[PDB]
Amino acid sequence: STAEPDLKTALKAVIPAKRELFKQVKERSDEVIGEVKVANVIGGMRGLKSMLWEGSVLDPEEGIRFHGKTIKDCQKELPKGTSGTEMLPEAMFWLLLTGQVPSTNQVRAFSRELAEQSHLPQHILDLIKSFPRSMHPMTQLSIAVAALNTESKFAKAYEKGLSKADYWEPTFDDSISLLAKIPRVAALVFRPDEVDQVGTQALDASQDWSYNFAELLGKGGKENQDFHDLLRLYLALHGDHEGGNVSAHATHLVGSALSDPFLSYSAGLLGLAGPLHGLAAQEVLRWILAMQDKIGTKDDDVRNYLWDTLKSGRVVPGYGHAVLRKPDPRFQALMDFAATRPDVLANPVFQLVKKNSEIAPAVLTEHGKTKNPHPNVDAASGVLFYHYGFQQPLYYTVTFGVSRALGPLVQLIWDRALGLPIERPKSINLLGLK
Amino acid sequence: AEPDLKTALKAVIPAKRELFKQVKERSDEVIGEVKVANVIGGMRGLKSMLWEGSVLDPEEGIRFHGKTIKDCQKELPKGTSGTEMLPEAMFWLLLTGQVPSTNQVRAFSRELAEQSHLPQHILDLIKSFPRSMHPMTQLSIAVAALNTESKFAKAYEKGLSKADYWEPTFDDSISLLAKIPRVAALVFRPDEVDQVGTQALDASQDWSYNFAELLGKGGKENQDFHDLLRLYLALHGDHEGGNVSAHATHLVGSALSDPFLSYSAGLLGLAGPLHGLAAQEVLRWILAMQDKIGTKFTDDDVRNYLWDTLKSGRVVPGYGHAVLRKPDPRFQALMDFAATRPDVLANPVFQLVKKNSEIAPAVLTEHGKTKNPHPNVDAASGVLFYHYGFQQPLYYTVTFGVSRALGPLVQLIWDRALGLPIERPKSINLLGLK
């Protein structure tokens, strides 16, 4: 018999190595690694290698990787739930933060902490009851998450006097706290009539984070285990996708001024509430339902509708990437999940998604407007939730919000451990570029 | 006859689009190097974003479409009574590039007064905040919650051409601007939410005057405070894009989140101790100095305290810049305001600010650690508010929040008129930098 370390202790063990690596990179401070062009200034920094992000790197052949591991490696190696086939988001968080795969026992102890720390102050429940029905769900989520800054250990510690070398410890604490609480907050956004019951309902401390999220959404018990596996997979896959995306970047940006994790990830959610970032899954579902509606329920069928769409100036949602040359491995992971659930395979709406994925890439290639027109993860995610009875697309981004806490919180902990300074680029006006 | 603000903006849009198109012809032109230092130093020195309204001149300080603070003091419309320039006039300049007439500003002021009421749900939201909640958190949340009233969110959902994105963005920007003073006043006055929240404003008075009225400093007896508030709000409106509140607003806004969600994100950055605490820090330090050296100090007494400060390792707040070689002209504008008010001149605390501004630069130059050691605007601003009876420094960032709506909202309107894309830099990990 031997002792197994908790998440904080595992993080502490890999901190010195990262600091040694950081110090070596600093010796190369003057080394040139690229050029700033006018294109980069007016194209929202596109292709400008200008920020640090430890947890995930996009490989152009294999897609997103987490400390060098593919989605397929993660599905195989990361710990599962006490029931189910899919990898756990808490395990993904552990991997993102430490660079190492946790044992099963380590993940269970982490899950338990997350269940025990999930309760909300009374003032947050009052805040949520104040929201009108017309308020966008993503707005409700961003606000409620910011409001949890009342519970921030970092805010309080920084005010009192705190060593720069130790800024990470309170940041970690708040990150775990945020993580514990956010599923509950999301469930209250889904269920505005049940705030008092859902807001205080005790969780089963022996179950995983995704299971408990499902329970607070009204989908608990063994009868909903298929949904539990979807939710686990979905949450793990959307946790991190580099630093350049707006929710990750905004979190890093705001956090670099030493706003605590609650205020920082709030800012990330505000970016995620943007139609060009987080509402892609909702847009795809809408477009698939509109397509089913026009063709009813009739391989060659789909092609006419696609061509009709492109020749009218509209885009096919859920298709394309600027760098990835193959289908998004996260998309593939959602279809592998579908492949073993016969009932999802029999849903007409998923059948329509699947046919379109086998036909649209050829069609979009021949049309030539969009480079790398392969399905991305947003093609599939909406339909899967729709199958399990989440039929209001407005809330899809809320689920992405929960998931997307994982990666940016990890980077925030590392930003503070490494002592990274405030993000301060230099602006210029158009006249100044002549 | 004279145009309204929207029509004045419309007239200058095509010229900017023509200029943008010329800058695009030069897209391949190199304008800098990316070094490892830039990646790990949060993009410092990396000329990588567009910002139309303000450019920092290293000799003359911040300039607004080529105009110095002194040009603005001379040329911009004042209030119906009062010596200081109006923030509404500054907004007009920032947005159009042109100085409005007096009649144009009065019509703009009236629109801002007419649009200042809040939905009941925002008042309910604010009553839910506990007393312990940081005032900047309250402000960010309340601003986000106004996204219920966003014309852009609604218009984008319904179908809206890219060429017209600016019109609803403008509308929401004016709406946010109208409402934010009231929101800030509710943050200052949590006991008076019902009365302050619905109190009718004088539609013939300027924006700053109405802010002062809702803060409890209305009437003829507070005219001098009114002039300070006008000046303060106008001067802090815009200071390039690289600062965290401006940048976060642009960032989130580039995903097409509306101005309410975007400026909320800016406020979350502003709530960061590395961004919004400078005025508070200076006031505390000036009061500590007065406590040590008294009211009847000599030049040697001031010089001695500064030396004692620097030889103990501490920094003098409000002094120094990386680029600007003269005193901040915004600082000078606050001292020009003081120069005509005999009572401010007689306050020992202001006398200490003024003396320190004449002595500390010499002292900091000789000490050698601080680069360009001239006063910036934060040297003066706190003491001025403290003179007029704003003695709660925790709320000075809220006032900065109100002011700092002006510039970032202007940029957002231009971002949408020009069709600028989403902000998406490229990240790399430390191992990728070796």
Coordinates of all heavy atoms in Angstrom, one line a residue, chain B residues 105-115 202-205:
Chain B
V105 N -24.1 69.4 -29.8 CA -23.9 68.8 -28.5 C -25.1 68.9 -27.5 O -25.4 67.9 -26.8 CB -22.7 69.4 -27.7 CG1 -22.5 68.8 -26.3 CG2 -21.4 69.1 -28.5
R106 N -25.8 70.0 -27.6 CA -27.1 70.1 -26.7 C -28.2 69.0 -27.1 O -28.8 68.5 -26.3 CB -27.7 71.5 -26.8 CG -26.8 72.6 -26.3 CD -26.5 72.6 -24.9 NE -25.6 73.7 -24.6 CZ -24.3 73.6 -24.3 NH1 -23.7 72.5 -24.1 NH2 -23.6 74.7 -24.1
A107 N -28.3 68.9 -28.4 CA -29.2 67.8 -29.0 C -28.7 66.4 -28.6 O -29.5 65.5 -28.3 CB -29.4 68.0 -30.5
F108 N -27.4 66.2 -28.6 CA -26.9 64.9 -28.2 C -27.1 64.7 -26.7 O -27.5 63.6 -26.3 CB -25.4 64.8 -28.6 CG -24.8 63.4 -28.3 CD1 -25.6 62.3 -28.4 CD2 -23.5 63.3 -27.9 CE1 -25.0 61.0 -28.1 CE2 -22.9 62.1 -27.6 CZ -23.7 61.0 -27.7
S109 N -26.9 65.7 -25.8 CA -27.1 65.7 -24.4 C -28.5 65.2 -24.0 O -28.7 64.5 -23.1 CB -26.8 67.0 -23.8 OG -25.4 67.3 -24.0
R110 N -29.5 65.8 -24.8 CA -30.9 65.6 -24.6 C -31.2 64.1 -24.9 O -31.9 63.5 -24.1 CB -31.7 66.5 -25.4 CG -33.2 66.3 -25.2 CD -33.9 67.5 -25.9 NE -33.7 68.7 -25.2 CZ -34.3 69.1 -24.1 NH1 -35.2 68.4 -23.5 NH2 -34.0 70.3 -23.6
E111 N -30.7 63.6 -26.0 CA -30.9 62.1 -26.3 C -30.4 61.3 -25.2 O -31.1 60.3 -24.7 CB -30.2 61.7 -27.6 CG -30.9 61.9 -28.9 CD -29.9 62.3 -30.0 OE1 -28.7 61.9 -30.0 OE2 -30.3 63.1 -31.0
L112 N -29.2 61.6 -24.6 CA -28.7 60.9 -23.5 C -29.5 60.9 -22.2 O -29.5 60.0 -21.5 CB -27.2 61.3 -23.3 CG -26.2 61.0 -24.3 CD1 -24.9 61.6 -24.0 CD2 -26.0 59.5 -24.4
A113 N -30.1 62.0 -22.0 CA -31.0 62.2 -20.8 C -32.3 61.4 -21.0 O -32.7 60.7 -20.0 CB -31.3 63.6 -20.6
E114 N -32.9 61.5 -22.2 CA -34.1 60.8 -22.5 C -34.0 59.2 -22.5 O -34.9 58.6 -22.0 CB -34.6 61.2 -23.9 CG -35.2 62.7 -24.0 CD -35.4 63.2 -25.5 OE1 -34.7 62.8 -26.4 OE2 -36.2 64.1 -25.7
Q115 N -32.9 58.7 -22.9 CA -32.6 57.3 -22.9 C -32.0 56.7 -21.5 O -31.5 55.6 -21.5 CB -31.7 56.9 -24.0 CG -32.3 57.0 -25.4 CD -31.2 56.9 -26.5 OE1 -30.9 57.8 -27.2 NE2 -30.8 55.6 -26.6
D202 N -33.2 66.0 -15.5 CA -33.4 67.2 -16.3 C -32.8 67.0 -17.7 O -31.6 66.9 -17.9 CB -32.8 68.4 -15.5 CG -33.2 69.8 -16.1 OD1 -33.6 69.9 -17.3 OD2 -33.0 70.8 -15.4
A203 N -33.8 66.9 -18.6 CA -33.4 66.7 -20.0 C -32.7 67.8 -20.7 O -32.1 67.6 -21.8 CB -34.6 66.3 -20.8
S204 N -32.6 69.0 -20.1 CA -31.8 70.1 -20.6 C -30.4 70.2 -20.0 O -29.7 71.2 -20.4 CB -32.6 71.4 -20.4 OG -32.6 71.7 -19.0
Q205 N -29.9 69.3 -19.2 CA -28.6 69.3 -18.6 C -27.7 68.2 -19.2 O -28.2 67.2 -19.7 CB -28.6 69.1 -17.1 CG -29.3 70.2 -16.3 CD -28.4 71.4 -16.1 OE1 -27.3 71.5 -16.7 NE2 -28.7 72.3 -15.2

